[PDB]
Amino acid sequence: GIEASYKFLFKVLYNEEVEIEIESGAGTEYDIIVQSDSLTEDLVGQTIY
C-alpha cells in the first residue's frame, strides 16, 4: 500500500513503468501570497483552484 508498492508492483508484475498520481506527491514547495480572512484552516491539505 505504500506508493513504492504501486511502482514496484508492475516491475515484478509487468516489468514496465507505471506512475500513479497523488496530489501531495514528491514535489513540495510554495510561492504566492494569500489575502483571506480567518479561513477555517481545515482546508490545509485540501486543494483549491
Binding site: 480572512d37 480567518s38 479561513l39 477555517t40 484552516e41 481545515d42
Partner: protein, 51 residues
C-alpha cells in the same frame, strides 16, 4: 480529563509546609482565526457558565 483536585495533590506535595492552597481555573482556547469562526466552530467539550 483534567482534574483541579488531582493537580492539587502535587502542589500540596511540594513543600510539606504548605498549610493550604486553592485556585480558580479558566480554560483557555486560543483561536487562530478571528473574523470567521471555524465554520464548524470551537467547542470545549465542557459546558461553561453564561457570559
Amino acid at each position: 480529563s483534567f482534574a483541579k483536585s488531582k493537580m492539587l495533590t502535587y502542589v500540596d506535595d511540594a513543600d510539606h509546609s504548605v498549610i493550604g492552597s486553592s485556585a480558580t481555573i479558566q480554560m483557555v482556547r486560543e483561536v487562530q482565526n478571528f473574523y470567521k469562526t471555524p465554520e464548524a466552530g470551537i467547542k470545549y467539550n465542557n459546558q461553561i457558565k453564561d457570559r
